[PDB]
């Protein structure tokens, strides 16, 4: 009976091992000792996808923390999967991820993984289909359930804003800014210790509107998705890419913390190769060098053998080209 | 086939016995003889809840009218129930309530029983979940079906506006005012004889925004839900509560008709006790005295043995503490 | 698995026979040689309705093009049918219509066939029920699939705006204008060769708001639904109807292209007769004379034996009164 449906419960924070909160101070993330923190890690696939092949397990997290040097895992929660499993079930699985991550001393970025234009509720693909109401409700539920949980560090409000050349709507920064501020207000009303992560247009590549009209809230970080072909210099070299990246997203790191929550590549003739993830490999050192210089955090896309570009070729964790590259980088940084 | 789906019908007004319309005149409700009218009654549970236990029957209405002195029943129509039964079936059951009430000479308040912030479509619990579209459609259907039915006196547009400390959205009077005016306009387009009832924030407790920006429509009344702990004076007495109630909602009765569509209490250690319905009992005489002085109408929450705070302890209508208290008050007022 | 659902594909334009695009220039439609073009044709029923009785077939289009003189068919896509068949299946059937029409050298008007007020998402009947999100998605999908297809000439954004005497919402031209501009922008982003068709209030009858506040986009045309009883002169004659039609919709043809996407009549005591389609027959020559004089395009409602007013009495295409009349008119004009 509907009148017997219980009110929701909050995650039991006393079940967790000690773990520092991460907070925003100026243009940096810091831990509870004031030491500069950098999120360095990977995306995994949607929980529902992993469950379907029996790969949603602690052993996945252990492999990453122990053998790949990650301090962060990004969970891309697809709206279609949220609906298919249903909120109560999906949240129960996120609880498992919180416990596994906490046990390993690593952090989670929760990503509402849609692609398109939320103000008009039009999207790149139905797997990303959502509504303002559903998006608000997702964040209402998440914020309430994970109040005062250090393991869950970042709430990435909407993965990839895009109008696909204004076919989905008319991109308008003021309208998108206002909507992010509305989401932030709902979150901050319920938990002020979380870090909202806000994205610009062109699939979370273009942060340039924040130069004139930044989000008017404190404690936030900005996303960037600097895939190799987002910048298109006529001549491909460090100088030309750095200038282009500087103007579109890199500048943000001077004033706000930035997380490159998606990056990576595959050979142009490789598995699942498509624009804008095609590259000969020179991008890897280039993007790492740039991020290092700017102090930018990152989560590689994606630690999965099916979704591309892959970091692994199988569920024995055989590394792909980009996987082998980032594995060495992250292990050195740890 | 979808192209064969028939257009809706209206309630047959000729099936009803003679009953006066209630109308708004200034700060008062009046009957068709211009005599001041006060709604005095109770809430019952959602129709779907009552149906599930075979308690949706005329005998319920008869008990209330004959033995509890009510002239009004408030039906709190939960959106989840509206969806579960479906509009056509739910409306058929509301038709039954109209006939029963009309036969007894009593009135109905139809309440779109949601709790939360409609402009962002975020709510306290999924049982209240709705949308602006669904809310409009509810009032479109209701207004059409019950055109020119005196028995259905009041359309209470949205039970309890709240943002739950701005966790549901940013409370904003201007946007809420505009949305109520939109709903009123749809209703008045279809039936001008109905009384819309409009609520403020803090779970329909705070009417103070209407001092500066009242709804810009005539013929309306304002709701109040003055539960015992909504006002929180340091020292609990008549003087201190009256002052607080005056500033938040009582003042409205000087200019507009007011209906306290929810009120009541249970002991702090009693069944279903929670903030803000906890009280030692002194509230009962206090709220009745205040409403009497201001000429405020009321429907007690709730005449049900499960939902709290209860007016009855069972379906034999054994009165609870607050039930026994309000029963005597209403029976006296009916005289 | 949801992650394996493929991305959509576009119609194969190389499968089509040569056919001129139609474009807007000033107050006229023109072909690719700059010659003035007039859409002259009929509505058929919703694809889903036709499928249910096995009447969705090329032979329908052939009958119309060969024997009724049409150069245009309007497809009224009902939202309930779009949902029932589902977008992928419905689009597959529209692909059939594109091929059939193209093979015959005729054109299609795609009509999102709702009746009501999209800004509040309230409608005359559930078969028309939709949302802004669904309406946008329909046009997103259509525009992408039929990019660079000359056969599909017109995208009629929303069949019949009405608030039904403000029972559905408060009619507001600025709000409706803005929403049409938003739809136009999504379409033009994906295909600039299409012609959007925009409607006014009173069931797409009243274009008068465009005198002061026209849609601020180029390449658009305006719809009119001049059913016989939309204008109500005291004395029914050419002079009095022409004056009324001039003021409400005819004036638009002086500045913009106009398509009367619905028109027609049945005797007042005839099959499916209702306001505002009732007429003695004198309307037929009258509306044709008016349109001819103004250079207005048209699609008669409706070439179906069930939906009214009918152009045919059966699926052997036995003409009704209005069908016989318009058949002769269209056949002559095709010369
Ligand atoms: O799902 C099986 C199917 O998956 C394809 O992988 C897709 C990924 O490539 C895709 O990654 C994209 C991100 O989701 C976006 O945020 C970003 O803009 O673009 C990324 C790619 O550049 O994610 C989806 C799920 O969201 C995956 O379906 C494989 O490429 C394909 O081989 C396989 O059949
Ligand atoms: O439903 C089963 C569950 O019911 C609980 O009763 C609830 C009522 O206490 C509740 O009353 C509230 C109103 O609905 C609100 O408008 C108002 O803000 O506060 C009232 C007092 O809380 O209504 C809900 C349904 O809307 C009832 O479910 C019982 O407390 C519980 O024991 C029982 O199992
Ligand atoms: O479908 C079965 C039922 O259909 C009725 O036909 C209806 C048509 O008359 C109706 O046409 C209207 C248009 O849809 C509107 O755009 C316009 O304002 O008015 C037209 C005529 O009044 O369309 C609906 C479907 O949209 C049809 O149902 C038959 O008249 C009836 O006998 C039959 O049982
Ligand atoms: Cl964009
Ligand atoms: Cl509130
Ligand atoms: Cl209208
Ligand atoms: Mg946290
Ligand atoms: Mg009434
Ligand atoms: Mg075209």
UniProtKB/TrEMBL annotation, chains B, C:
It comes from the Bacteria. One of its GO terms (biological process) is glucan catabolic process. Keywords: Glycosidase, Hydrolase, Metal-binding, Signal. InterPro entries: GH, Glyco_hydro_5. The keyword Lipoprotein does not apply. GO terms for molecular function: hydrolase activity, hydrolyzing O-glycosyl compounds; metal ion binding. Mg(2+) binds at residues 149, 152. Residues 31-304 form the Glycoside hydrolase family domain. The keyword Glycosyltransferase does not apply. Gene3D superfamilies: Glycosidases. Belongs to the glycosyl hydrolase 5 (cellulase A) family. This is Putative retaining b-glycosidase. It comes from Saccharophagus degradans (strain 2-40 / ATCC 43961 / DSM 17024).
